[model samples]
Target: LELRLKSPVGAEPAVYPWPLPVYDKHHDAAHEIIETIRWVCEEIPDLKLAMENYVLIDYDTKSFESMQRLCDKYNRAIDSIHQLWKGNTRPSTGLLRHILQQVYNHSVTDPEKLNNYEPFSPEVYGETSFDLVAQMIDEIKMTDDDLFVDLGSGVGQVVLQVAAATNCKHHYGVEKADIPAKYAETMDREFRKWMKWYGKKHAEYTLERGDFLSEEWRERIANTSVIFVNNFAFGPEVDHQLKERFANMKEGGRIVSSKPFAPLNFRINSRNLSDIGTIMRVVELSPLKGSWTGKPVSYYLHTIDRTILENYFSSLKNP
Candidate 1:
């Protein structure tokens, strides 16, 4: 469920594409502007007596100008989704919901919108256990040959980080929204640009736009040996998609997850801290059978040492 914070807009735990509301704010701002324009065309003149009977140029043209400005502002906010580089601070959600919320007042959409509904748990990304992700990786037994594909790719952080670590042959991200998809493309390009700037040929990545459950799309990484899922389980839509990915995966592929939503034949208990605990307590701090509802203080903030992580990998039995 999306948490509504009226103060400074925030996000789910390290969510993709950006914070849920940040992406939402940009989208909402645009819709608000569009709605304001429509309302002004229909309502503002009624609120003012002078403007009512004034087709003779005695009316408040300023009010009409305000409506036009609203439209312009909407266009500007929507521009960020297209232009890229929304500054140093990024949001927790993608660009989809932000726009939809603002246009909620309008009746221009169709039934097809149901397929694109996003009731995902933004809380899971920002708050959950990286330990859980680690645990998933441990259970599935990942290797350098494996690739990590984050469907609903968001900002592409999950793919980027794993690719950086494993130096995998492929890094895959799939986003369905134009805005978020464009953002991911921008990120991939920028990464390559940076890599080139440093004198490497270029960084390699695969960013795509498509529904995760589409049967038309074949499993590209059928030989993939590792997989990571970030299933928040906040809604039926997310639950369905996550499960579909698991079902579609090839045999022997490892699975890493930010939460415990995926089904598994085996389990590996990793004692690493991955989720954001302090600011995002929802996903990271779930109580299992242990006596502690949460891990030790600073456990989450502390990095899982590479040596330990490697040893943890060493402990895994081969498939």
Candidate 2:
């Protein structure tokens, strides 16, 4: 049995095996492939024009010859466009997300494998959607000198997305859970393979199975230029410990978290000298849509700035 995917553009018809390869219970590879083709065509007008407007296939039978021709034509369209886009272009958000979906489909074939953890535990997992990540990328600027880390990174999805989108010197994802940590390994391999498949380049990144709160991580956290943590479900103790780590970050360092560690209206005063707010400025960013909650969630951006405390001290002395 076969499934014929009618192309959105008038290109060669895409054919897939029946009982389409399922990534999870909900998503199938055929639909994803169709979406990818449609998106690529939308992005590259030449592709749509080169291949006619409608993809056609013999309605009654599965023709391997036609399938092969269609496959080659599609690959050639992608490859040629990729060659022209070699030097300065980055993958569009839609394309990157599509690539990531493909990687996840291939790597983590069983979502149930990750359900071993207790519900609502700090170690519980959820994903930050590609749209939210794209928003963060646009809001936070990273340079080649910047090092990026995702605390409590699950399956390293966020880290992979960031590595592909930014030119950070290096990206790191530290996961503590057993199942997700193991899955992260597969994600890393799949990411590299798919990125190469699309003729795309990404910044160096590593997905490690280690505790972010470990002693060694303190130094690493302090040295990182940008840190991302989806700490919405983390307990107060973990958040407090994270604040302690943020205190040591160099001036101008930035931390993006689902929850704010400090009060939004933080003011430096004689009584609150030890507060994390006194050392860094925290501001609520525009609401972002997340995957798990299916609601718009607010994120906090914390910038390490010792001058806030220093200015307080200077004000006291001058007064």
Candidate 3:
């Protein structure tokens, strides 16, 4: 059973168009819904078996529809099924939880908020869904010795989740914006407290307050085992920067991006480009669901290589 949070009816419009929580009540309702869904996933008979790794969000209509069928068969109490299917209900609890975490307490947003930064790209913050977070952790198979970094980590949701969920000991997040960076630090503090007092799992993380593009920051990133980037807000300049960044990385490292990075060009300064294959090999693509139930996302996992192609790029840059 998938639980969705009810959206506010007759709500005043905010600056942004997308669904964002305006008040504390929105978070209250969402947590209640999260608890409800968690109950069903744990208590339901065929569901616990069927819904492993897929419980938190509503990705498959078929699976949820099957849940409805089973609920009917078992005489389980569903408040209303017809309205959810035919009448149009509200956002899922998963979506609400996702939204609440991302909608930081910062007053300034979008371009005005973005103008304070020197990075050419504006802050088009899209929080990575927790469902995709789980999928990525599984796909990458992060280990205790690995170092995880999230470049442009807005509010530090993804990095925090990665550090908490995986065996990785060192997790880092670098965000260009001040507002988001501060919120990330706040979250890091809260998460540490939670882990220390109540949580069974814990991981060390450094939520850096700086741009990932800085030469100093890139140096810190060069040795990371796994890196995540939501570079949809970026363009070719960032792509070019990352190509240079990857060259410094040790082989066997992995980079995950919401949008694909440009293919590795061995002949950096030449007129012709395209090679036998890309320098980074794809591990997984478009596998999991996003925060918004209807809107799915494409996840691209690429492995870095320190090959002859990498050496070629080094020579061109050095020469």
lDDT for every model? 0.39, 0.75, 0.55
Worst 10 residues of 1 by lDDT: 5-14
Please write out the lDDT profile of model 1 over residues 1-319, one tens digit for every residue. Answer: 1211110111111111211222232333323433333332332232232222333223222254443443334334334322443451211122212212222212212324324344232222323333333333333344556566766666454554344334456778876766556555655655443322222231245878887667654465334455444454347776655445454445444444445442222223454223122111112322353244444421111111233334446677543
Candidate 1 accuracy as lDDT: 0.39
Error of 2 at 243 (Å): 1.6
Query: Which 10 consecutive positions of candidate 2 have the poorest summed lDDT?
Result: 119-128
Regions of candidate 2 where Cα sits further than 4 Å from its true position = 1-19, 39-47, 50-52, 56-88, 116-128, 287-295
Q: Distance from true position, residue 297, model 1, in Å?
A: 11
lDDT by residue (1-319, candidate 3, tens digit) is 2423221221221121113223242333233334434544433344444433433454322344543443332222222321334461222334333333433333223334434353222232233466566667767787888999999876676776676667687999888878777667666765554333221254677888887878797777788889898776778788778767876677788888876664433334345334322455654365533224523566777787536466667777898
Candidate 2 residue-wise lDDT, 1-319, digit = tens: 5544333333444455755576654566655755666776777687776654545332112344554455456666756655666742567777888878777777786777777454322122234467567778888989999999999888888899899999999999999999889988999998886676445679999999999998999999999999998887888898889888888899999999877888999878889998999888898886443233444656789999899988998998998
C-alpha TM-score for every candidate: 0.39, 0.80, 0.57
**Number of the top candidate by lDDT?**
2
Best by TM-score: 2
- Please tell me which model should have the higher TM-score, number 1 or number 3: 3
Backbone clashes counted, model 2: 3
